Amino acid sequence: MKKVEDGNILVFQVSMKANKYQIKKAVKELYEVDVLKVNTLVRPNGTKKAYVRLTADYDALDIANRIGYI
Amino acid sequence: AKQSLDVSSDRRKARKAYFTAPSSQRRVLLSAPLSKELRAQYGIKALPIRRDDEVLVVRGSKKGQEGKISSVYRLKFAVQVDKVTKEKVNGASVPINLHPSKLVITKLHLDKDRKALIQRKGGKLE
Amino acid sequence: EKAGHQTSAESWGTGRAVARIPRVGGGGTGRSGQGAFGNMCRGGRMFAPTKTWRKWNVKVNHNEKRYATASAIAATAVASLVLARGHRVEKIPEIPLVVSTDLESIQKTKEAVAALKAVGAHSDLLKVLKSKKLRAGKGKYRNRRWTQRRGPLVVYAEDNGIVKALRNVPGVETANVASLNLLQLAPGAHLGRFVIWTEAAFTKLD
Amino acid sequence: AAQKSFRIKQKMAKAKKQNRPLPQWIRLRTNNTIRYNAKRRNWRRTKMNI
Amino acid sequence: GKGTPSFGKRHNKSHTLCNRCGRRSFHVQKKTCSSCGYPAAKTRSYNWGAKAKRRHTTGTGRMRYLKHVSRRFKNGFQTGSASKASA
Amino acid sequence: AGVKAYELRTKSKEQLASQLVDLKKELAELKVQKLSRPSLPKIKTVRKSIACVLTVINEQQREAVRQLYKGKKYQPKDLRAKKTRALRRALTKFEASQVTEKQRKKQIAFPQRKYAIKA
RNA sequence: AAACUUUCAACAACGGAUCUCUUGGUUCUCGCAUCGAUGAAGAACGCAGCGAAAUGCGAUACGUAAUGUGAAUUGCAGAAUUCCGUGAAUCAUCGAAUCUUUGAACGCACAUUGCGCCCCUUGGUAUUCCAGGGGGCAUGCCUGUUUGAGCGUCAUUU
């Protein structure tokens, strides 16, 4: 949540099978949003985290409580 | 005496098939006899108990009580009646589990299918 | 044939302050170190394991078999034997008790019981029935749950319904004269079965 | 160990997930028979052998 | 020093996990599995090891396809579909 | 709720794709909700609904191909009968019943006769 | 005389014998003939509203479709439209599918989620570079197709 409020970053659990390209395209298509760059890590429970930074035209906080969470 | 080569008198095997019987198999094992009046009414002795049926307890401590089967609790080989319960010490209430072989069916819940059953057994229906 | 022997266990030899049965090897489980194989060991193979090629059946000279069943038949006359054997024949008309060939034609249990009763078996029939008990064994769970006495043995020349009208009445047995079995004529090797003969069967005897 | 392969890490993940007490609702199921989790591992009582 | 001071130097694996059998008996330098024989096309087994066999024979796993062969045999390897009926 | 197949098979190919996309959007939302919530069973039914729709899309595509291959030598292996590997080698009835010209004559002239004893 | 020790008994401990159980085992007998490149047996990792296992399943994941049944499932919650019904069910049956990563295991490797090539397609100003989607490329052998090699060898050119 903090990364969202402070870093214009959406955080998703994402498919193990997907790469930075596929994550970027996906977020774009699913959210009408523009991604600056995508960092990823594999969690210690066998799942992938994507730190997705949107470009400065977008407001991830806004865009996260449009998808519906908090 | 059995006579066929495909029925087993074996006790082990019989207990095994009882206790591990699948749901569909327990519906039939959980039959209740009809009441004297229902038996003349439909010309038929017993039927697999079924939920919204109406029923008289005729053995055990609840002998004489009656109500509607609220669920057929097949997992437990038991039936519950909304009207026959235990009031606990904490005032909370809890169903009592009854066996269909100890009930009598006093009013049937009817479907196309239920009527079709009674007819398949060569019964008659009001 | 493999029980007691599914280990690689070895003796530990002497000099280890410990009895020399083989012991399961390895470590880390509680089993390892323990007496193996021998018949005094938990989990060992038993002494002299039973084998299927034990003798089960027994040859008896055919002629001696016959002597025996002949003797047994002879004793089904002779009231006191029949009495001694259990069997409530203290008021049957006479012995051998012979009954009309019409019996072999009864199809219906209830008629069949009626007839046996009329000819005098009421009290033996009642004795079976009065005598069902749970068997005292472990037999009780090896398909041998109940116990009961032996009723009359009804013998006929032609099965025209009777063996089927009688098969459900407790303790009553039926035999064709042509056969005739020692296990039935002298249950438990006690001479004296109560036998009800149909005429057709009584004269085929010779 | 400490710069790992995906295979070992994948195994470690499955290991972390299996590491927890009985989910207590299970205790209440009809004919339930499981008291507690008898396959609980601990990093300083038993080793994984990879 | 052949006992415990020398047990302290044990920090290197002779075997890792075997792709084929999962077991951690894949000998690294030998590149072959001490249990199932990988990458031999065949599977290690020995008639002097009945226990081991029983530990690994068919039926000790899911039988994902073989499970169903006997039903399929039973109904004469049917094809098509079941039709319909009533009540 | 949950979609029924027998209603799915009355839909056009492109309706079904579109309902697939609809369900997926919905599943996506449910999953957002699920983590703001103590429990969320309805998600089960939307994901069995996707299962169903995919099944029905696959069904149709398959019998489409099945039919435009019905009645020719060579059809794709995963529409060929399964049977069993052995059964599937295994002489055809025709091959098995092949009989030599010399056999055939002998069978014709001297077949097993029906006969009976008495007189 | 106590305490202490020893013996007996009663009640209480410790321990789990004994008795009675038995959805297991063991042996006998009868009937039957069906694994796999159409990817088997086995492995790994996953999948439920709330599961660590066992059981089941495969990103369609304790299940999808079909069929029979005829109202449950049940630890709690739940849906609620599913109850004179194309219709409940952790039901039975099962003929249609889905079937991750693997494994004889097949593009090459594999202590690597490592590294190519080909075709169709989409996106980036692109036959050439990058990225997405689909579809492919192991070995021996057999019949056949095509393209070829050899003064092994026939004939035919002028």
Added chain:
RNA sequence: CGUGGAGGUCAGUGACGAAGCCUAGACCGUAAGGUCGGGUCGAACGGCCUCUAGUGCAGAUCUUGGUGGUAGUAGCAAAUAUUCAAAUGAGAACUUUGAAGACUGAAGUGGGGAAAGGUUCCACGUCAACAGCAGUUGGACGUGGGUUAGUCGAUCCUAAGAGAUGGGGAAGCUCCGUUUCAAAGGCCUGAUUUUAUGCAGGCCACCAUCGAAAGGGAAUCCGGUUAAGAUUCCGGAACCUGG
């Protein structure tokens, strides 16, 4: 004499209490044993004729399980060392904070890593077990959070060596050989303006592949930032490779 099972019989005993167990109470037997009463108990069991055997224990440094005396005993003594007060808490020699006395003494009891482990890291809760006193503390228990890279490693390369392939042995699982006694393969552009890629030159004959997280090797730094990440995030400013 006694035990598990079997055929027969006593229409045997029993929820109004079967079996079992206890009992310096009774009685029968030379004895093996048998019978009773009382207490405990809860679902079955026995007499007699006969059948049958996995049929009778004190021992076997017997087997498995349980249990004693030993005994509140040996002991809990290496690594210089502890102290005052407050706070918290049911509870404080042992937790936290303050104070003081010391130690390791940069060949560290400091600050990081390789192998190995695998969550032990961090936070909140928290003491039944565990940390051979304790416990409010913990690497314990419960519930959660946490590991971000074009530039750091892997990935590429080759080392000792491993190992497919044409082949040659071997009944065979397989053994030999690695450029070997093989018809071993792909690049650069031109030729296309039916068209997408057939042929036209000329080369090059190098004939697998695996094998180093210390060897070889394209390229990133400073400042800030977290409960826990950082040459990986943020700020700034660079550089390499491909197009």
Added chain:
RNA sequence: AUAUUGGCGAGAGACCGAUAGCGAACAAGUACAGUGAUGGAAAGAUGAAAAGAACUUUGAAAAGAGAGUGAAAAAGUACGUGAAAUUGUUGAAAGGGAAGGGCAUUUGAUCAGACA
């Protein structure tokens, strides 16, 4: 026509009865050991029904004491029966370097029978 300690489906036993029977009646080829080949356990039973002890009281808590449920808590998720070794309390007795035993009687305690 013959074979068959494997597979699928069945019917059975003068068989074993939880230290027995297969190693496994159970989340058993599990847990656990070993670098590896391999080795490999223990572990069934409240009650018809959880009716699994509301409530009061003492306690930091665990629990105790009441109450309550139940045919029974002399069945309380340590759970049917609940032996022995071994232990606590109570009661009775003996004991100057063991104890226990035989024949006999005193003393104490205890008890059957038989009288009519």
